[PDB]
UniProtKB/Swiss-Prot annotation:
Belongs to the protein kinase superfamily. Ser/Thr protein kinase family. WEE1 subfamily. Mg(2+) 1 binds at N139, D153. The modification Phosphoserine is found at S15, S20. The active site is at D134. Phosphorylated during M and G1 phases. Also autophosphorylated. Acts as a negative regulator of entry into mitosis (G2 to M transition) by protecting the nucleus from cytoplasmically activated cyclin B1-complexed CDK1 before the onset of mitosis by mediating phosphorylation of CDK1 on 'Tyr-15'. Specifically phosphorylates and inactivates cyclin B1-complexed CDK1 reaching a maximum during G2 phase and a minimum as cells enter M phase. Phosphorylation of cyclin B1-CDK1 occurs exclusively on 'Tyr-15' and phosphorylation of monomeric CDK1 does not occur. Its activity increases during S and G2 phases and decreases at M phase when it is hyperphosphorylated. It comes from Homo sapiens. Residues 7-259 form the Protein kinase domain. It is found in: Nucleus. This is Wee1-like protein kinase. ATP binds at I13, G14, S15, G16, E17, F18, G19, S20, V21, K36. Mg(2+) 2 binds at N50, G155. Transmembrane segments: none annotated.
Amino acid sequence: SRYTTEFHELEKIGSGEFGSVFKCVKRLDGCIYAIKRSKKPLAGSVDEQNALREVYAHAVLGQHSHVVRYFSAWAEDDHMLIQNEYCNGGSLADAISENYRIMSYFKEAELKDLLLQVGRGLRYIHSMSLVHMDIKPSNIFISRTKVMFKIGDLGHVTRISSPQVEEGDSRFLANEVLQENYTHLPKADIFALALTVVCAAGAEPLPRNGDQWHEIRQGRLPRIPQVLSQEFTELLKVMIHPDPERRPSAMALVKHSVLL
Ligand SMILES: COc1cc(Nc2c(C#N)cnc3cc(OCCCN4CCN(C)CC4)c(OC)cc23)c(Cl)cc1Cl
Ligand SMILES: [Cl-]
């Protein structure tokens, strides 16, 4: 098995609907990698599509400091193995869960840093005529010594010119995408980033549907318990503006004054 030949497994660090993730050391270089193990996708299926969307995206983007690196992919028996860059701080979703456990939180300065760094990631991706289409806390990773945020899971990445949309998490999805309007897809990433920061700021779990869902797509920011500057709250608000064209672009977001 290539997996045991090339790597030594240190511990299982994640398991879910989309596979398990293992912290592994590669024998040859002594470096740590995050390896995802999953069911070999059915040939001709959506899962296969996701997998190929992912390879294409990394192939186009190459290495970028705000995108989780993608090294190699192969199969053993009925399973797919993918070797990724290890982000020792875990996912943002897990950090938020940790913040709750120990009564800690991301103050405003750190939220701006989050918004800025992931924004730079989005700016690069969009500059390459790609959109991510699944920005959410479980797809943002943390690399630390002091902190680097990185965009992971490129399985939904598609081309702005002639897109194939596998619609992302309903809780982070812009209304226009739900309406099968695929004409301003980069602004969908922007919308999703705002709500990602909103979760990190300590907002209640986001709605999947119903009144609360629509209220947000009306441009209403979910309730956040910590005090934030109005200038910052207004920035998050315009990022979920019902008109996608009124939302800042990534390049506009990173050039924005309100961020460091
Ligand atoms: C959503 O999509 C994808 C997500 C992943 N997942 C990860 C990537 C990536 N990429 C990178 N880095 C990761 C780091 C993780 O944990 C770091 C901290 C672990 N600690 C070990 C020590 N003890 C004491 C506490 C826990 C991690 O854990 C769940 C998952 C990671 C992959 Cl591999 C592929 C896809 Cl497609
Ligand atoms: Cl509904």
